[PDB]
């Protein structure tokens, strides 16, 4: 029974996916426990959102386009929530992610891959921790 | 214009969010704020409905608004007032148009899913309430 | 707080539309109270279902179709269920039904309109005693 | 081959009997009977579940399967059985595939919305009860 | 009875062609004829729009056609030229009903997704220009 | 990239073709050809299937694809032949998977709804025929 964090992301805006989206997650029965609505997310933000990926070479291109529009950050709640999310997040690339998922079915770019999804009850909390303090 | 959109706790418990948002999504208006409510706060919810303050159904409109999660939005567009007021549908299952939100999904005067400002002065007064 | 009698149409099989049908009834709100399946209802059933319209030239017609394929008899509830669900049942001419309706979406056709609803508290009671005694 | 399925009360109370048999329409199979219970007799259920009767949840299970509505399906196509199973998706939430009814819709490993027989022996079975 | 429907530049801009299309499809209106033109040329559609040349519109409407691909589709059915009119729905954002195409997904006088024949002169008149 | 995309009778005798093309167009490919057949020349199809020329199949297969409307599409984006070859799904109605085309609405060997390139070599030859 634990609440994970979830980011609806600009390409979701831009293509007009934000309702399709949440409506996967909401058709699997999770619930909303909190939701903001950035126009744009502050640089901070984003930077510690995805800072266990500082390192890597596409950190700056991925922090510019997670401002390039706006954003909406839940947090669901359900029996083992993270896991399930996940699940219907589908891979990050698009030769990977199942038909079925949110990616397999509407994504077709490594970057511009319409949400996040925590990745273990650390990352859930910590991020959680970072749009809901 | 802008406008200001409340969805009702009975969306929250008919897992009706989504798709009442995407009605708007897909009619093309723009979000410019928005913020969930688990409960929103009683006076909130009657300053919302102050202009019908002297109505019979007016506790009991207070009781059922309070009586879930709310998201409240405010929405962007050309002439979204008057168009999102179309879309939502009218206020009597009696009368609702199918096509329309209410007319597809509401079935209850008061547990109608979708509140959307009636006009610009509204939208000014309850955008400014939900959001300050 | 009514009952009413839906009758989903032969031609509602055809076209796969059996789900598509119900499914709108079911996002109104209205609850299900009884439903029978008929691979091929009984003729008798059909022509007192249809007897107020035993003079007309289309009778002839329009009990052949309803046997030309499976049926499904559904008794709806919900406040005021007769005159809602003849709202989203849409107008019988193809020329005057609101886009937005069950006929006005998907019939194409005066006969083949793919559902039947009670027109009154009268009728609906007759009708529910026929497919339901 | 012949299956039975079982719309359960889950089903009922998230509006979702449409959506589910949606999906097999879709698939392509045919209704060959279909009986509405607005609240199973329980030894139907757990004749039903014979095969579970040993199990911890045996009781949550009947218990579940009896407080709401149920619709008992018969579906007809080719490799019907096999079929309608890989649609129906696992038990088990953590393991249900993004695709599948279970998949897509269930969040619980007992209220998971759809039964579909397992077998040609089960399905000749189930079918005997539900419709003699 | 025939009738000519363009997929504008718009539609494939907001992906909603397959919606658009699905809608006609649903109707049980037949395709008789269709071809994808990444960017049509001129001539054609200002040949498709002669009847509106002296509009205030005309210029801004022939490179809005021509801002991205189009398809043309012939339907077929009894009554299809009013019957897609009526599933079109009106031109303007303001009228437009719910359960329109336009009501629905349009929200602009000129970006509306869809072009239908209005009478059986035009169907043969655009028929003619998008398929000789 | 490119590939060639074949909606066959099948998708017009049920109806699904808004459906299959909507999938496609939600994955965000782009259309860059696209012509109907009210019903293809029997060599542009046995061209098509050369490769199968000597297969139990290949005349029934054949008779099929002439025996109602087919869509021939080039589809355009990053990896469009395997992207799309998965979101088609297994030729096997028992073996592809709930959540691609086939695995939600094909159930049957050769009525199978769609035809997708294999190849960049497959993708040419299959272009050419449909469009040169
Ligand atoms: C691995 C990878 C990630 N990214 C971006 C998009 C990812 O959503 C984000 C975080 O990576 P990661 O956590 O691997 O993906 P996911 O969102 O599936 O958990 O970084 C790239 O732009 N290119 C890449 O090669
Ligand atoms: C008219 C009416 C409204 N209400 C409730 C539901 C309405 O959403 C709310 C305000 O009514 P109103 O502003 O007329 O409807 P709308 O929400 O369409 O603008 O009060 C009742 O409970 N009973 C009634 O008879
Ligand atoms: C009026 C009419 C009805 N019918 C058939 C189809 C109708 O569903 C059925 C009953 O007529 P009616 O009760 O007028 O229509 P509805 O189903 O909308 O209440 O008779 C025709 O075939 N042709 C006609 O001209
Ligand atoms: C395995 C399992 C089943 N059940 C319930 C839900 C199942 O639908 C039912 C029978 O289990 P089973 O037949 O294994 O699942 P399926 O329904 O996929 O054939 O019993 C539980 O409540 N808890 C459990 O741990
Ligand atoms: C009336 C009008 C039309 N148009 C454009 C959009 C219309 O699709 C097109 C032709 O107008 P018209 O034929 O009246 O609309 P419809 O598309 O319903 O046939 O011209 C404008 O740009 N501005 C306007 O004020
Ligand atoms: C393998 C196979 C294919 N076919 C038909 C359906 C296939 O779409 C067509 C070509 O086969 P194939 O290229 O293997 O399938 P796909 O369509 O996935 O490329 O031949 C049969 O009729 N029977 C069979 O046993
Ligand atoms: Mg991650
Ligand atoms: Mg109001
Ligand atoms: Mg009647
Ligand atoms: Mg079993
Ligand atoms: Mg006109
Ligand atoms: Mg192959």
Redesign the pocket.
């Known amino acids: 029974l634990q609440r994970t964090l979830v980011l609806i992301k600009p390409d979701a805006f831009e293509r007009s996916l934000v309702a399709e989206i949440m409506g996967r997650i909401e058709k699997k029965n999770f619930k909303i426990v909190s939701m903001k609505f950035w126009s744009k997310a502050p640089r901070n933000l984003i930077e510690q959102h ?1 800072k266990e ?1 500082s390192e890597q070479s ?1 950190f700056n ?2 922090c510019d386009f997670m401002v390039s529009g706006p954003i909406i950050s839940i947090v669901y709640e359900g029996t083992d929530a993270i896991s399930k999310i996940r699940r219907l ?1 589908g891979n ?1 690339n698009p030769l990977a992610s199942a038909p079925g998922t949110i990616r397999g079915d509407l994504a077709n770019d ?2 511009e ?1 319409l949400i ?1 999804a925590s ?1 273990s009850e650390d990352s859930a909390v910590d991020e959680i921790s970072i749009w809901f303090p």
Chains 1, 3 share one sequence.
């Open positions: 995805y990926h596409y291109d991925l997040q990050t490594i970057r891959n996040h990745d």
